[PDB]
Specification:
1 helix, Leukocidin-like, toxin activity (chains A, B, C, D, E, F), secreted (chains A, B, C, D, E, F), 6 chains, Aerolysin/haemolysin_CS (chains A, B, C, D, E, F), toxin (chains A, B, C, D, E, F), flat, part of a larger assembly, five-stranded antiparallel sheet, 18 strands, seven-stranded antiparallel sheet, signal (chains A, B, C, D, E, F), mainly beta
């Protein structure tokens, strides 16, 4: 923090005495079920060595957790979102560069407990016949407890370059009706992967034995809303003051299949089965200070 | 804090009534997979005995966690980042000096529990005949519990001088599928180092038995984003008002090998096998208040 | 706090409508490995009965955790920082005085749990022979738990005077690979002081059986960064408007020796074996409002 | 808070549109080891029915935890601060009055646990010899847990009047190498008061079996820094616009003795053995709005 | 909150563009040991439908925990504060009214834990004489835990009217040397009420077997500092612009007695034995905007 | 929050550049024991489509917990507040409307722990006669605990309309001397409802076996202070600029009865035995911007 280095808070921040131009650009991809919104801000601070553009990618990518396949009452398939992504890419010719972005990857932590306990105890017996009993015992034990927080989905900043940046919101694990947590690799000898299995050996049809979307992570169905910021800089002396940039919203889906084993339900998950990719190109005019698509 | 010594908050900070000049310089080193960004700020506060330059080293070093070695079905190696580093250095013929930096090393703490428990307990018996049972016991107990937090990586400020300063974000330890945690020295007689081992005796190719990056620290794969601040002071009277400074982003990688031993998997970790070093020289002009590369 | 006594917050603080003069002074002691930085601020608030100078002592003293001795693979010694110190001192004839300082010693606390638990229980036994029976017991138990946080190092304000003030950041205790915590007095008959012992029976050179510095408190190696403040007051009527003041950064190292008895590893620690002291005189000029060295 | 009663925050606070006069006064009592500082502030708010003086007593009273005597290697004494005090008092005649002060006595709390547990259990047995045993038992348990925080020292506001006010920072209890806590009355039949006892059977000299100050509350040794505030009000029409006020800084020391019985060490603590009192008279001039000593 | 109803914060508060008149009035009652202070504020905001007076009652009522009776060496009584009260009252003829007050009563809460546990287990044994047996057991548990915070004293707003309001800070319960808590009704057939009993068998005289006040809630001895606010509104058209008001500081003391039975100590507490009442008449002048006594 | 939708904080709030008129209206209902205070604010913001009036209902409704009948030493009746209510209502012909209100009903949460535990243990026996016994056993456990906070009273927003709004603060449950919690339906075959039962076997007059109010929720006796806000909107073009509004403050009492069976005390509670309703009519004049009663 600036105060950590004895400098008035905000002194090195950009944007004072500058007229900022902002804009909203909304696009809805019906086919891919994606509400894509770009919120931008041009900050041409004359005391900063370069022009600046802040591109915030928001909107919402529908989860689309649903039963798509049905072949009899013994088998059924559920397509679900295992990953959500947003990426911005400047073509190689562009002199403009990706300079910063938020959020980024943070360091996770964990709690660790080490426990040592000593135990000494006595004892004395006695019966209605005159016999006197007794006992002496010792005991020791070491224990360890590991504790940590596990989000249903992880928000990750993908290694960026000066031309492209991206984020992927990936399914981590999830609690199934107090059971689990389960993940894309969970495997039980009897039931396989119970990730979205409603009952282990219920009587109903397969297509009706998938977890209630309302009982699973809301991102799986209703969707995920990106809230990412990308900072792009541009030399003021650059000969060409226009820049193209592609923005891609994507959804990776897994395949969760159920099938009656004759005595119980067994689950199977196939990773990255389908990939819904919606791309769009925008035009950045550093002179008019507007962005169009 | 200022209020702690009866002085109006901020009274002592540098920067007020000063026109600050800022700049951004981006550099992508593809072979080393490093998005290196310098955010600078020149503060020439006339009420401060020296000129200040605040250099912020950001951007992000890719993790690059990958199975690069595959020597048959029983052998495979994984390269991973055991350390990320950023260092700034002023040559010896410079009158400019390193004055402050952030973050710095913090004093870690731990929680401790001391427990003493003791009690007594009666007892009486009797069978369908006439015998009477009776017991009397005592028991003492002593237990101690140590509880502390462990981040996946530790952020450390390396001993600085007035010419050089640096930080290293080193791998600490990590939880492997609700187990461990493990570190670079974890050693088990049967499985060796299980740090990134996915299964202990599963039957798949070696190169397919490494832990999914999505299940390990995101820094290992997607990467770490430095956010370090360095402040450099310069005398307004020094003969030469130009300073060179070299900035180095570095990634030290370890080698995690896995090999099948007739009946199970075993792992070994080789420390600091590789070191990806990306260096760049910057020119600092205190009169123009510009920084360039 | 001001609010607690019905006064507008900040009403009694010093520094308003005053032009504050500040400065940075950096000195690097190569022999002692100390980056010493003074950040001062002159506050001559005319509505205050005296001139005021705030001296912030910062920079960082390197830890210097290193194996220095090694007499055969069975003997080796390690030097570590048990204490870091920073002191300011006005020569006795100075009319200027030390008036305040920060941080100060805070009152430590602890959590105490006292538990009383009792209960009754019954029982009924039988056998295919047709026998009947029953057991009746009762129990009581009293237990208590003590909980408190222990920093690896304690930051202490030494008893000051109107001519000298100082701080010592002393090693308290530390966790050794999930065990401990250990301290300078930890003693085990079999292994002695295991503070920095890597393994108990390990079969390696003694110079290789010391704990990895990354697995220990970062202040031990990379170092500690002081951030203390000292306020000095001065009478405006004082005849000599110049004041000398010496600042001393200090490091105290202990000696942790490891030797192989014949069956296992044993450790010993020698207190305050070495003392690195780096002193420096500064001149305070209350008329020019500048500090020089 | 003002907002709780629908009034603009800070509307009723004193001090606005007022020129406040502050001052600092430092005195060092060499014999008593007391750095005494008084930071004052005159607030003559014309919209207030009275002139105000806020006196903040700060500085530091050294702990002085010291081994003072030793007659035989089996007997020794340690002096320690069981209490620190700061008191202000206006002479009888004075028309000025003690109006407010901070801190004050807060209401302590405790956490309480009530737990009831019901249970039943069965147990069917037998043996290779055809036998078949049975078992049916029940149990009930009632237990409570008290949980509270306990500072090493308590800060108490002594019953004030309109002429005097004072604070005492008294020793409460302390953890001794993870045992206890102990206090001035602790008593073990064998060891006596183990308050500052380093070892129970140690064979060193008595003056070498006292707890190291680094492992005990820093107030005991390095000292305590008062930070108390007193508000004095004065009528503008009082015919005598000058006021004297006396201030006492005090340390009360206990006597902790260790003597070797013949088999082990035994501790004894005698209360209030010594008292170090430092008194000063300050002169308050409400017309010149300055305080002197 | 104002934001909860989409209104700019502070929009409805009173006090803007208004000159507020404040005052301090101090009274010390020697006989009753009560420092009494009124801090008033007249807010005649012309955009408010009435004149307002905020009266804050502070100061401090001494605890006065004292051994007042000593009938021989086996009987002694201790007077302690079971309640502190502060009340304000407008004579019923006054047209001025009590409008608000703070603090008020808050709704307490408690935490509730419900636990169900079930488990199975096997057990196979064998002896040198070839005998081989087995065992199977099943069990269930149902636990309930109640957790809640217990302040040593409760701060309560007494049912107000438009002419009188008061607060009472009443003794709730207290811990005695890690035991209890105990309260005015605690009773043990052996030792009676152990609230302030130092020892159960101590061979000292009665007067010397009372709990050390330093080891009891500091409000019992040093005292309680009231910090209550009362808002009084007044019609601007009222013919009589002056109002009288009485303020009462009060202390209710209980009588805790200890007597030696012959084998142990037994204590008993008598409620509301004594009542110290300190009343004072103040004059409120709404035109001159001043309070006097 | 505005920031969530990229809008300058406070941008959409109402109140700026508007002269707000406020007022206080106090009424004390003697017979009903209710201090009723209304604090209103007219906000006619010309950039808002309607005039606004914020009405805040405050003051306090006495609890009035009291023994109302003693028909014998074996029978007594206790009256206590099971619910507090405040309701506002616009007569059906009013064009003005109820637009907002605070507080509202919030979603309650609970914590759930699900735990699984399994383990093994051996046991080797042996006696002097030469016998050598052994034992091996397994064990599994499934336990889960529910954890949630329970306030003594619930604050509920009754289903509002454009003409009426109201709140009811209702008794939920309460801890009775560390046991329970008990509620209006608690029942024990032996004791009935122990909600306010002081002792189970005690031999005193019935009217003397009710819980001490100081040991129960303060709302039961001293009372509850409403702090509700309701905003009314009005069209500036509405033909009649005068509005009537009726306000109800109310207390619902339950009848708690204790009778002596002959061997112990048994408690009974009858719901909504009494209702104390206090109603007032206020006149709102939107042109004069004043409220009166």
């Amino acid at each position: 923090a600036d105060s950590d280095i004895n400098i008035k808070t905000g002194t090195t921040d950009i944007g004072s005495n500058t007229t900022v131009k902002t804009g909203d650009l909304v696009t809805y991809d019906k086919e891919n079920g994606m509400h894509k919104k770009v919120f931008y801000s041009f900050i041409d601070d004359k005391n900063h060595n370069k022009k600046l553009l802040v591109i915030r990618t928001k909107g919402t990518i529908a989860g689309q957790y649903r039963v798509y396949s049905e072949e009899g009452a013994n088998k059924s398939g559920l397509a679900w979102p295992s990953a959500f992504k947003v990426q911005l890419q400047l073509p190689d010719n562009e002199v403009a560069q990706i300079s910063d972005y938020y959020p980024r990857n943070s360091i996770d932590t964990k709690e660790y407990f080490s426990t040592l306990t000593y135990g000494f105890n006595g004892n004395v017996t006695g019966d209605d016949t005159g016999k006197i009993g007794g006992l002496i015992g010792a005991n020791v034990s070491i224990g360890h407890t590991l504790k940590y927080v596990q989000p249903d989905f992880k928000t990750i900043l993908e290694s960026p370059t000066d031309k492209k940046v991206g984020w992927k919101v990936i399914f981590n694990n999830m609690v199934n009706q107090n059971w689990g947590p389960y993940d894309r690799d969970s495997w039980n000898p009897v039931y396989g992967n119970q990730l979205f299995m409603k009952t282990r050996n219920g009587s109903m049809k397969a297509a009706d034995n998938f977890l209630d979307p309302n009982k699973a992570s809301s991102l799986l169905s209703s969707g995920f809303s990106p809230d990412f910021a990308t900072v792009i800089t541009m030399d003021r002396k650059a000969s060409k003051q226009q820049t193209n940039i592609d923005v891609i919203y994507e959804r990776v889906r897994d395949d969760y299949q159920l099938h009656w084993t004759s005595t119980n339900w067994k689950g199977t998950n196939t990773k990255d089965k389908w990939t819904d990719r919606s791309s769009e190109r925008y035009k950045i005019d550093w002179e008019k200070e507007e962005m169009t698509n």
